[PDB]
From Swiss-Prot:
Binding-site positions, Zn(2+): D3, C10, H73
Occurrences of domain CARD (ranges): 6-97
Domain notes for this protein: The linker region, also named autoinhibitory interface, is required to prevent constitutive activation and maintain CARD9 in an autoinhibitory state. Disruption of this region triggers polymerization and activation, leading to formation of BCL10-nucleating filaments.
Outcome (variant: R70W): In IMD103; reduced cytokine production in response to C.albicans infection; impaired NF-kappa-B transcriptional activity; reduced production IgG antibodies in response to C.albicans infection
Subunit details: Monomer. Homodimer; homodimerization is mediated by the CARD domain which forms an extensive interaction with the adjacent linker and coiled-coil regions; leads to an autoinhibited state. Homomultimer; polymerizes following activation, forming a nucleating helical template that seeds BCL10-filament formation via a CARD-CARD interaction. Interacts (via CARD domain) with BCL10 (via CARD domain); interaction takes place following CARD9 activation and polymerization, leading to the formation of a filamentous CBM complex assembly.
Disease entry from the Swiss-Prot or TrEMBL record: Immunodeficiency 103, susceptibility to fungal infections: An autosomal recessive primary immunodeficiency disorder with altered immune responses and impaired clearance of fungal infections, selective against Candida. It is characterized by persistent and/or recurrent infections of the skin, nails and mucous membranes caused by organisms of the genus Candida, mainly Candida albicans.
Name of the molecule in the record: Caspase recruitment domain-containing protein 9
Effect of R35Q: In IMD103; abolished homooligomerization and formation of BCL10-nucleating filaments; reduced cytokine production in response to C.albicans infection; reduced production IgG antibodies in response to C.albicans infection
């Protein structure tokens, strides 16, 4: 069991994509998927679903990534999974494969 992660590298790359990520990704849509991957907390699910309209989405996903970094690279893998599942063309941009 290690103290902290070095995945600040992984999530600072997503900052370079944040302008697209926070616009295209539905954070409230994938809340049970992120908890299934054990990268989202029950309290944070309640706080993301607190917006029924999701017109504030471009703030919501940005604050979501802040919380997901704290699960290390596992949040980043479950992130790329949610992209590969729901948004194929966005996934190809973010991973760049
Ligand atoms: Zn990493």
């Amino acid at each position: 069991m290690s103290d902290y992660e070095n995945d600040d590298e992984c999530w600072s790359v997503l900052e370079g994509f944040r302008v697209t990520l926070t616009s295209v990704i539905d954070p409230s849509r994938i809340t049970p998927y992120l908890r299934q991957c054990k990268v989202l907390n029950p309290d944070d699910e309640e706080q993301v679903l607190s917006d029924p309209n999701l017109v504030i989405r471009k703030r919501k996903v940005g604050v979501l990534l802040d919380i997901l970094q704290r699960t290390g690279h596992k949040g980043y893998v479950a992130f790329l999974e949610s992209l590969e599942l729901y948004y194929p063309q966005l996934y190809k941009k973010v991973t760049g494969k």
